[PDB]
């Protein structure tokens with residue numbers, strides 16, 4: 258409360274660390290469904306169904322331009338990519354399984370990097 262401050266973690270490296278995690282995401286062999294925005298006019302239904310599209314390049318743009326207030330808003334956008342993927346694709350479709358794989362990969366790197 259007022260004039261009573263809880264110790265807060267050192268967040269000085271958060272930008273660099275999220276950037277490094279994102280780079281690893283981007284280089285993963287299963288990243289291809291998520292590298293660029295979905296072709297809004299080539300994937301029928303995607304525009305109406307997916308209310309908040311997100312993808313790695315858009316996350317990179319936002320990260321590079323100071324559009325994430327904190328590391329948690331960055332994680333929200335990454336998870337959004339995979340939540341959207343789950344909504345639209347079958348679990349055992351190539352794109353669906355890629356999403357599950359990428360999510361697992363992200364959450365471990367997230368835990369390992371920040372859950373000190």
Ligand SMILES: Oc1ccc2cc[nH]c2c1
Nearest residue numbers: 290291295300341342345
């Ligand atoms: O490459 C794709 C194609 C379709 C969807 C729907 C959510 N994420 C997607 C990624």
